[PDB]
Amino acid sequence: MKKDIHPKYEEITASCSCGNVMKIRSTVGHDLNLDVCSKCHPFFTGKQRDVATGGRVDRFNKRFNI
């Protein structure tokens, strides 16, 4: 490849909220902590057979009085 013209392309760890951690040689600059992924997405594995950790729970499920 060429030299002194491309950005930094180190090896980075990416950890999602469901516990799926992926080793990927990427160009970001620092560690990553994402939320969704292939394993924790509704459409990919069961639309009503997935759980989330966001707007459906944190803001709402703590406060419901049903």
Partner 1 sequence: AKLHDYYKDEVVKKLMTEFNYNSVMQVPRVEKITLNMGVGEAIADKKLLDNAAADLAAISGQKPLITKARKSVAGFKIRQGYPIGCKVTLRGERMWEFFERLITIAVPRIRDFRGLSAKSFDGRGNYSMGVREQIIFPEIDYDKVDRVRGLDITITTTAKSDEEGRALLAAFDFPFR
Partner 2 sequence: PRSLKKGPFIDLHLLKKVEKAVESGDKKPLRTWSRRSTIFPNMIGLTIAVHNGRQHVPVFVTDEMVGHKLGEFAPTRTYRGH
* Long-range contacts of 1-7, Cβ-Cβ distance < 8 Å, separation of 24 or more: none
Does 66 sit near RNA (CB under 7 A)?
A: no
Residue 46 near which of RNA, partner 2, partner 1, none (CB within 5-8 Å, type-dependent): none
Q: Does 63 bind RNA (CB under 7 A)?
A: yes
16: annotated binding-site residue?
A: yes
Largest CA distance in the chain: 62
If binding is defined by CB under 8 A, does position 18 make contact with partner 1? no
What minimum distance in Å lies between the beta carbon of 39 and partner 2?
A: 18
**Calpha distance 32→24 (Å, rounded):** 11
